């Protein structure tokens, strides 16, 4: 039936997709490997104050568009010390629209997740989380979040695999 297909499809999806920043959305540490502030050049390339190029992993825009097409809102959770620079990159890559709720500061990821739950009201069991660091996957899984370990940046295959893992885990 049409309503059954619709509601079953809705129920299989996470209610929040949480992303780390460094090595998840972009291939570097924002507090170490680049020299802020940043700007977008006339050719459309974002660069740091020494003229070094800064970009997202190539499939990140498509990944985030796909989540949006599925109705899954986003959040950011990063321990970077370069908070201003991280927020400037979110602006320059046109990602603030997707990442409404953000915990960007040094600290425990368990603290980040507590604060994201407060800001969104979403139970941990209805969250999915993508992170390059296995230790974060181990820790945040203890809260009941479905945690997907990233290798070599976020991409479409990782998103697909993650969503299926989440759907099976219910």
Sheet with 74-78: list strands edge to edge.
99-104, 74-78, 16-19, 127-131, 146-149
Q: Is 22 labeled as ligand-binding? A: yes
Place of tokens 């985030």: 64
Nominal resolution (angstroms):
1.8
35 assigned binding-site residue = no
The rounded distance, in Å, linking the Cα atoms of 115 and 113 is 5
Domain of 22: which CATH number?
A: 3.40.50.1000
Of the candidates 149, 152, 106, the one whose C-alpha atom is nearest the C-alpha of residue 128 is 149
Q: Are 167 and 146 in contact (CB under 8 A)?
A: no
Both tokens of 152, joined, read 């070599």
Three-class SS of residue 19?
strand
Domain that holds residue 65: 1-170
Please confirm, yes or no, whether 131 is among the known catalytic residues.
Answer: no
Q: After which residues is the chain broken (C to N over 2.5 A)?
A: none
- The count of domains in the chain is 1
125 is in an annotated binding site: no
Q: Up-side HSE of residue 118: CA atoms within 13 Å toward CB?
A: 8
Q: Reduce the secondary structure of 45-89 to three states and give it as a string.
A: CEECCCCCEECCCCCHHHHHHHHHHHCCCEEEEECCCCHHHHHHH
The strand pair at 74-78 and 39-40 is best described as unpaired
Residue 119 in marked binding region: no
Annotated active-site residue in 20, 31, 43, 94? 20
**In sequence order, what are the residues at sequence separation of 6 or more whose Cβ sits closer than 8 angstroms to the Cβ of residue 141?**
147
20 is annotated as an active-site residue: yes
Is residue 60 within 8 Å of residue 153, measured between CB atoms?
Answer: yes
Cα end-to-end span (Å), the chain:
22
**Technique that determined the structure:** X-ray
Tokens 């498509």 sit on residue: 62
Catalytic member of 22, 35, 43, 48: 22
Distance CA 101, CA 85 (A): 17
Residue 24, C-beta contacts closer than 8 angstroms, at least 6 positions apart: 130, 131, 132, 150, 153, 154
- Burial class (CB within 10 angstroms; exposed 0-12, middle 13-18, buried 19+) of 64: buried
What does the alpha-carbon distance between residue 124 and residue 75 come to, in Å, rounded to a whole number? 13
User: By C-alpha distance, which of 72, 98, 83, 69 is closest to 30?
Assistant: 83
């Amino acid at each position: 039936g049409t309503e059954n297909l619709y509601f079953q499809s809705m129920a299989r999806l996470p209610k929040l997709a949480v992303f780390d920043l460094d090595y998840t959305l972009w291939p570097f540490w924002v507090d170490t490997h680049v020299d802020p502030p940043f700007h977008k050049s006339s050719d459309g390339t974002v660069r740091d104050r020494r003229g070094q190029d800064v970009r997202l992993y190539p499939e990140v825009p498509e990944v985030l568009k796909r989540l949006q097409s599925l109705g899954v809102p986003g959040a950011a959770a990063s321990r970077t010390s370069e908070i201003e620079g991280a927020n400037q990159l979110l602006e320059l890559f046109d990602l603030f629209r997707y990442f409404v709720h953000r915990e960007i500061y040094p600290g425990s990821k368990i603290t980040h997740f507590e604060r994201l739950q407060q800001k969104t009201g979403i139970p941990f069991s209805q969250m999915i989380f993508f992170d390059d660091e296995r230790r974060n996957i181990v820790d945040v899984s203890k809260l009941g979040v479905t945690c997907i370990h990233i290798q070599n940046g976020m991409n479409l295959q990782t998103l697909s695999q993650g969503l299926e893992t989440f759907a099976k885990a219910q």
